[PDB]
């Protein structure tokens, strides 16, 4: 924590290194979830399945 009347950590636009407002307050890091897309590599139906 840094100062009492303001504790919600956030640095650029969306990181928001806090949660909302706990009684113990204080801020550690951010890891809600982070995963991306998928693609399929094929050689050709008439070549293989």
């Amino acid at each position: 924590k840094f100062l009492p009347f303001q504790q919600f950590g956030r640095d650029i636009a969306d990181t928001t290194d806090a949660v909302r407002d706990p009684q113990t307050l204080e801020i550690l890091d951010i890891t809600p979830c982070s995963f991306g897309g998928v693609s399929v590599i094929t050689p050709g139906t008439n070549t293989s399945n």
Partner: peptide
Amino acid sequence: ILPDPSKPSKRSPIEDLLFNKVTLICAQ
């Protein structure tokens, strides 16, 4: 102009300068 084997990057001195000069922006 040709690459210098001493540098692990395997790039020429002019290429290294151009690589260094070119640099929210990358944290979405």
